[PDB]
């Protein structure tokens, strides 16, 4: 009921205390596990089983060990009548029984005992005679005042149970040279090499190996001096790996050439090791590909996709702040306070860590040139984070304990000042901000990562598309495994040059239809060109381009300076009147999305023309183009229907003008709650849906993605929210709308395709949800594609 | 009888149940004749005849004309006139008619012989003009000659219309008759019988024509044989002494007095009174001149009301002492006349109360809820501009250009019309004191419109053709200058801006309105609560029939004085918890006081108070950032740097989705503690004064159960402290707004922890559509014009989308908490079409602003009966 025994060949419990379950199963596979008991009078009944199995209860020294699902007293049960095996060994164990019994159970500090040993000593403990231990025994006895086995255990069990319990027979590693204790991993936890990786200490007690007082030996010397025990250890290691089907971290004790197994748990491993060990164990036939896909956590894969620091622990004393892990990866460079200086420094070969209070669309140039980005404000889904995550570039955002003073070209963290040019390192996986130039780990030249991902690719049901707005980004996406473009944000296709920025600002500020017509035609080349490069890069793959959904305030550059730059790039009155007419109290719910293409169909005409102008031109250059055109911010069937009418109108003109007719698809964003509520009406008129879970989450919760920081931390602290809904998909709420739209849209159009291009498309827990809803694909930024690929597979296998 | 059915005074071969055999019109003529009306005699050729005409090779079936002749003998006999006889001419109209919707030829039977007789009875010019028009219409509708070709003869003659003699028209007639030969090659038929025959054939031919079949095949009119032909005697009121035309309402359309109300002209045609060539007279002059005809008119009017059970608007003609009923439709009426007539017809036993509730339109009722102008038509010559009807009602006062001067003038007894380009929250004081508000910029949802509509105060907004110059104390409409102090009148129902001091209608001795509303109250299922934030407004609400307060917006409870605004700004600008505590203590008295006044006004009724949901930017001073920081330091005492830093920390990109609602009370529970304390301190204080207090505390902008749970914990904590301190324990309820889509998606979880739901369809609609309620105007007009939206979703509830969430939350919450009460306090609560929807969903009540309560009351009743 309460006590669970285990011994040679027998085992009441199984692997399904944390140790009690492992000791039981490890004992049932026939290994030399010292017999013992596992508490959940009964300890007496079990003590009879452990007694008979050991032929002692003929002294029987015991040990008590604590063990939870998620300290140890050794050599208990020894008195003067208890003390066959050797005097030095006995008195040594006795002296250790007094120290460990008094520190763990009684409560006397170990310092008071080390004082007596230091006073007695000689230069080494191994030089002490048996008589010296006798004197040390008496000295330890005097420390108590300054005996019954049954009571020793009672007080030992009560003490261990203060903060389940395990009592086991004693195997002695302190009998002499042919005895000891050791630890190992069955394979290298850093590199994954299939070679025993551990230590061993002759003539010492359990934790003396790792205690550090003495220096352990290498396993290679155990093979030389103790071949019988090492021969059985090798066999036992391959035994444990063969049973659990995984690399192991074990504890073992040798008692006069008699190998005893004590503890064994699954080995914690690095990203490199997780993959190499997974790949090898597959080649070895040990595990199938299903299990292998489970053995590499998304955090493992994430480590192998970006640069890493050699040893995070080795710089803990240099961390000056901790922010949000906006985009994973390590970065090292010199402090910089402006995007302009980043591009300049990068052009010269200097690595720049861009540090700012906040990034604007103007800084996209310098953000791409910086090795890493550090921002004081903004969340994980902020603009800087998405762009950084898409580039696989290190970013630490929301560093609240930093104040930037761009005028004085310095930033402070409390009372410390870090000046421009000082070397700074960022850890985008942990958010740590470290002073100085820290070590990077070397990239893996492993073909293993490629092989492993091919298993996940062949295993996943979901396709993984990419969110890329430029030809170069689209190429990177395909290199990372993207099966197409799920979202090309057309509004984000004018950041490159002053030429492009001037064109957009001409369109935004346009007042007369003559002014707008000039701008839309001036934009046509940029769209057709940029759209052209993507089609060929994704040759043979679907490309979903979305109509403009601009943040009007974002395209704007003192009020006079703003108006000044616009006139350079119309009359002062036209600009002042237009700035007044464009300002919105809540632009996130204002004049954007398809509301823009509907009010001004000439704008949608240019884009659609530029798309087919590029599609036909590239098809004529041998490219297989599979284009899709998607409408943003739809809430009614009329909105989509209205825009589709324009698309097909341009389709007729384009195909006839160029003498080539292409098949194309037309679809809609599902990022408005209403769109999902009447999705059966939209499904009839749409070829595909793509959930925009950024806006949808915002509309469902009423959370302004910009201003949510005012209270998200309080909501998280008080259990109101279990996650940032902008990071982890809300299954109860947002997910209900997703299921609704998916089921409704497919019931109306069985050939409907359904995807997700919101930021949750790249979040593992959300990917598993999308797979459950039965979505056809997910779409995420380029450097998140491999994560979604593995996530899309782990939920399947 | 078989194919030809005669009708007219004393004759009715058909009946009302023959809409498909006769025409729709042919069936009405048959019914009007049976109920005893003075119908000019005529005959209806059935649709069977048309079908036989189509199946007989586009020729009149045998034996049909002899029936048409027998029916002609009736009309001739009844009228003592004959086709073609100039001594006693008979002229016919020919109207087509099917069973439902799908041209007329007048004065058929007219030729050179007949016209001479018509000239002897009606006048030479009139006879030859009618002959002219007949040639045109008959030549076009029956012969196929376009009117465009006839206008050539007239233009050519006029070269060598109302300024043309009769001798000229007799010649112009000759030109028209030549158009027959010069176009169709054949001659104008002079025999009346031949004209009719041709007219009948042309009607049956018009049935199977293209465009005509396109209308049926496109729309898909199931099961239609053909058109009937309605041939009716013409009748003239310009035939001398004993003739005339008139119009009337069977009751006064302005007052509802049961008394014929109309005009009458002796020896004139219907269009003669419209053109205004002569001035009509009172029906009394008819009772004197033609006592018999008038006596017959009184009997016809009594038949009309008896048959139609309503007041009627008619056209009648007296031809030679014989009264003829030509037209009649339900008479339009004012609100005052709508109610009185409805009440009188109930007392009269002519209709029951169920019908009466359907007769008074919500728009009728609204006229009686605000001041009115005595006679709108009488000031058309003074209208200088028209804006948007932001808030209905009349207003009259002297022009003023600042909210400050409005309060001053009001305090002195002067009626002030506040004129501005735009109102800001600073102007609430003067806007409340102004008789009416006029703004040059802004839409129906603009600041002036929202605030004015809530007060039931007249407002005309968006008057784009006015420019206000408050410095020079003038505003202009083109070249006209309207100076400060000039008398101006506003019509917030029509948007009219009228110069001068116009007359107001006298107050009503309206016991009828009270009686009528008691019928609607006894009929409606929904309760109607009120949205009021002040004691007076809550008192106003109850006087207007409110059964309680469905929503008291606490954020709207500090516009009254500088003291209160200074207090709020101290809370907003608070940095340290010590600063905030000081501010909250300054607010506690104002909250407790107002809650006492509200509770006392609603003695015995439920009062739902909502926790703060403030627009932070709204409480900040207007003007340039420098002036704001200066004014805040004065009110707060903080340094210029502290204020600049705080304003920066308060700014939000999208405040409507930002740090507001319950997110504020959760982050700062001391705020919720102050409010809740003020509530129960007031509840007990009023309870000790004999007031029955039924308080409810509502949480705003809830999207999760934890948010509501968190705040309820605070409510119950303060309730215990207050009750213990004051030695009195009151029962209270705690509930939530359902104005976030997620709240409805997981409403089963929130229902377990809420006593009531109140749908906030303003935010809910906004979140559902993604429409910024402020900035939606950027594109709403285009969406409405292009059929994208059928309505402004902020005005009419979106049943497919927002309504789906309402049904969801209502059903989920009640399944989780059977004792849950469900209401609606969004602006749709006062919109008739939305009220009917809420009744269908099974909501328990609607809540709307005070002066909209009577509207929701009537609406809640009209959807039931
Ligand atoms: Mg979006
Ligand atoms: Mg609200």
Residue numbers in the entry:
A (entry chain B): 2 to 17, 23 to 46, 66 to 82, 88 to 100, 107 to 119, 125 to 162, 167 to 191, 199 to 215, ...
B (entry chain A): 1 to 102, 107 to 164, 170 to 874
Paper text:
A central domain (CD, aa 380–515) catalyzing the phosphoryl group transfer from ATP to pyruvate–or from PEP to AMP–via a phospho-histidine intermediate mediates a catalytic cross-talk between the distant substrate binding domains.
The main difference is found in the NBD of both monomers with the A monomer reflecting an open conformation and the B monomer reflecting a closed conformation of this domain. Superimposition of the NBD subdomains highlights that NBD1 is reoriented by a large motion of about 40° around a hinge region consisting of two short peptide linkers formed by residues 112–115 and 195–200 towards NBD3. This cleft is no longer accessible in the closed form of the PPDK monomer. Yet, both monomers show electron density in the PBD for the co-crystallized substrate PEP. Besides, the NBD of monomer B exhibits additional density in both the mFo − DFc difference map and the feature enhanced maps (FEM, see methods section) probably reflecting a bound adenine nucleotide. The presence of two structurally distinct conformations of the PPDK monomer (NBD open versus closed) within a single crystal structure may suggest that these structural asymmetries reflect functional asymmetries in substrate binding and/or catalytic turnover in the individual subunits of the PPDK dimer.
